[PDB]
Design a protein around this ligand. Structure first.
Ligand SMILES: Nc1ncnc2c1ncn2[C@@H]1O[C@H](COP(=O)(O)OP(=O)(O)O)[C@@H](O)[C@H]1O
Ligand code: BEF
Ligand SMILES: [Mg+2]
Length: 700
């Protein structure tokens, strides 16, 4: 129970957890461990843990939170021998695995047995497991089948400052659960918390602040912000490799393309430095999320030895995204370059699209990056921006992800957890209640939720897609319209911002190009033609940047759309959604597609006010709109399906496609149930087309 007791147990010749003998590596590691800052307050932790259900723990980067606290908790439950496990949630998978291996080494056990990790598509745990590291998403997935989380006695949310929606949702679930289960302990850890906020959230939970730090990190700033960070970073790296002594380098960049380019740019410069200045060898390892794990774990490889003794030291440079921003202890790292940028998610409500954008990091992010040094040995962090900018310009904390995300998918994931009430589901920073309710009923009409508010198999499958639920339903139900691939492409195109560029000046030319890509019946089909042209010109080998520039298309969003198409396709193949397509020569090649649109966009339909008028009254609510000027369709029919709603001098609908009113009554009967449908001119029109159908189909 008390610290001295646990420490007395740790000194045992025989391992209390396996019954095997402690190797002296365990004891050397142990003597190293007891010099950590958090250790010097171990008891102070225990009697807080003993007397409180929820605890907030704050210690500087490298204090020993992630690796020592779960072990403390483990030794505190020693005399009881509970069948329940201890869970620790890292924000990234690499972190979870690395730390899991580390703690497995510290407890002198085999990884996967007593100490293990758990990630999607890979469970490294056994029936012997008492300590489990995992990602917050993985725990969030386990919570779907076990809403009480009976398998765990203590849960430790780590790096909870990131405010990722998985972390937020976890905090809310655990907060609601803590009133239900009193046998569950909850710890919240970070080096960069808004402590008072998290305390206030968890019923004024106590705070433990460990002031000590292992090794110092010498942070430096640039006298003036650099015009371009990339080559500023590369120049900094080369300057380190040249002037600075022995030590591995760590550099943070935004994207993967940028990382590769910078990687072999650094390589090409380094080789010249070798051939001209007799500099030591440098091995450059890239690191990003879409990499295969076996390449990700190559960053732990030892730095190359000097060419011959007494010569310039060889070293290892790691160019990575922000996945290495937290929780990583890469031994050998001394120098850390911080350009101060990250690819952060933003969200467009009108077009319903999530998109990434390079933005300045937060202060917490910067401190977290610099914290990757001074863990095993004293380090330095070269921040490529003014100290004044860091103190008075950088955001103090990362803006919550829930507020930058599609609430329909979020709500879908909440009902996926079985959260019966949302408005009184206490999120730390809750989204607008009405938006959540509208999201709920919109999910109800899409047959993703029952009238009772539970997951439809359709909705459950739609959650597996990285898309707006409507778009996802469209894609899933597309094979029933005999045009899966085309709808896949259209989906991927609607998953990205507007690919057509229409400059404020000289928009005539843009209209002319778009007219050359035009399809008379719908703008969606025009998008399809644009993508097909793109893939053709790419197939030739023609330069696609200049090609997109000339034909007034956005290379960024077309490329993004393409990658999205690949990923989506592989997902469909994984869950067994068959990709089929009617031949182009077929009579109903386009009608199939146009019908498949209504599978998900039946709620966004506009009817012409009257034959002579240009004004449209939308099916949703009753708002007067016009067809957006940038439209392709020459003569828009009485009924159109629109993908966007814009509000300017007058309200428009954008990216429209002509449909037939019968398709509405066919594809979405429950929504267009004329028995209970709202009174209005639309109901009248639909009753007319109905009556015609009755006539002809009773005639036989
Ligand atoms: N894989 C490892 N190899 C060597 N030393 C490590 C490793 N992981 C952690 N350490 C040491 O243990 C200390 C505690 O690290 P950690 O618990 O991850 O800190 P925190 O979780 O507080 O950020 C570090 O300062 C580091 O010196
Ligand atoms: F605070 Be430590 F770097 F996880
Ligand atoms: Mg940590």
């Amino acid at each position: 129970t008390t610290a001295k007791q646990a420490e007395a147990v740790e000194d045992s010749d025989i391992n209390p957890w396996t019954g095997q003998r402690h190797s002296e590596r365990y004891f050397k590691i142990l003597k190293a461990r007891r010099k950590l800052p958090v250790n010097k307050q171990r008891q102070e932790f225990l009697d807080l843990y003993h007397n409180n259900q929820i605890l907030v723990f704050v210690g500087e980067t490298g204090s020993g939170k992630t690796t020592q606290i779960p072990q403390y908790v483990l030794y505190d439950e020693l005399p009881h021998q509970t069948g329940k496990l201890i869970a620790c949630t890292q924000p990234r998978r690499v972190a979870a695995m690395s730390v899991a291996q580390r703690v497995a080494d510290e407890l002198d056990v085999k990884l996967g047995e007593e100490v293990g990790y758990s990630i999607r598509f890979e469970n490294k745990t056994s029936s012997k497991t008492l300590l489990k590291y995992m990602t917050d998403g993985q725990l969030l997935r386990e919570a779907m089948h076990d809403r009480d989380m009976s398998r765990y006695s203590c849960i430790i949310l780590d790096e909870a400052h990131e405010r990722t929606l998985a972390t937020d949702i976890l905090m809310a679930l655990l907060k609601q659960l803590s009133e239900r289960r009193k046998d569950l302990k909850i710890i919240v850890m970070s080096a960069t918390l808004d402590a008072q906020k998290f305390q206030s959230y968890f019923f004024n939970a106590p705070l433990l602040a460990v002031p000590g730090r292992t090794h110092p990190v010498e942070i430096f700033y640039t006298p003036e912000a650099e015009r371009d960070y990339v080559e500023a970073a590369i120049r900094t790296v080369l300057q380190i490799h040249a002037c600075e002594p022995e030590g591995d380098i760590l550099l943070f960049l935004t994207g993967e393309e940028e990382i590769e380019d910078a990687c072999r740019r650094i390589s090409l410069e380094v080789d010249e430095m070798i051939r001209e200045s007799d500099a030591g060898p440098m091995s450059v390892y890239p690191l990003y999320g879409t990499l295969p794990p076996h390449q990700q774990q190559r960053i732990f490889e030892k730095a190359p030895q000097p060419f011959r003794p007494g010569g310039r030291p060889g070293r290892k440079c790691i160019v990575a995204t922000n996945i290495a921003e937290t929780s990583l202890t890469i031994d050998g790292i001394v120098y850390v370059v911080d350009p101060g940028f990250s690819k952060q998610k933003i969200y467009n409500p009108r077009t319903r699209v999530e998109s990434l954008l390079v933005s300045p990091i937060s202060k917490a992010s910067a401190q977290q990056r610099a914290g990757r040094a001074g863990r095993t040995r004293p380090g330095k962090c070269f921040r490529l921006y003014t100290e004044e900018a860091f103190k008075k310009e950088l955001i103090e904390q990362t803006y919550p992800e829930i507020l930058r995300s599609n609430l329909s998918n979020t709500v879908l994931e909440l009902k996926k957890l079985g959260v019966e009430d949302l408005v009184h589901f206490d999120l730390m920073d809750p989204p607008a209640p009405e938006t959540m309710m509208r999201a709920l009923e919109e999910l109800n009409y899409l047959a993703c939720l029952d009238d009772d508010g539970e997951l439809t198999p359709l909705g459950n499958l739609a959650s597996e897609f990285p898309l707006d639920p409507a778009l996802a339903v469209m894609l899933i139900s597309s094979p029933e319209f005999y045009c899966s691939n085309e709808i896949l492409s259209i989906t991927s195109l609607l998953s990205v911002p507007q690919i057509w560029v229409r400059p404020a000046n000289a928009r005539k030319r843009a209209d002319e190009m778009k007219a050359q890509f035009a399809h008379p019946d719908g703008d969606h089909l025009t998008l399809l033609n644009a993508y097909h042209a793109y893939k053709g010109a790419e197939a030739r080998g023609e330069d696609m940047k200049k090609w997109c520039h000339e034909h007034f298309l956005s290379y960024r969003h077309l490329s993004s759309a393409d990658n999205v198409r690949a990923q989506l396709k592989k997902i469909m193949e994984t869950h067994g959604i068959e990709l089929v397509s009617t031949p182009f020569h077929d009579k109903n090649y386009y009608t199939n597609i146009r019908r498949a649109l209504l599978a998900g966009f039946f709620m966004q339909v506009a009817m012409r006010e009257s034959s002579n008028s240009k004004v449209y009254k939308t099916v949703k609510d009753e708002q007067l709109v016009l067809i957006h000027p940038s439209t392709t369709v020459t003569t828009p029919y009485e009924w159109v399906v629109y993908n966007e709603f814009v509000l300017t001098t007058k309200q428009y609908v954008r990216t429209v496609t002509n449909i037939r009113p019968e398709w509405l009554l066919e594809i979405a009967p429950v929504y267009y149930d004329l028995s209970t449908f709202q009174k209005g001119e639309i109901k009248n029109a639909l009753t007319r087309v109905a009556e015609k159908i009755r006539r002809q189909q009773a005639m036989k």
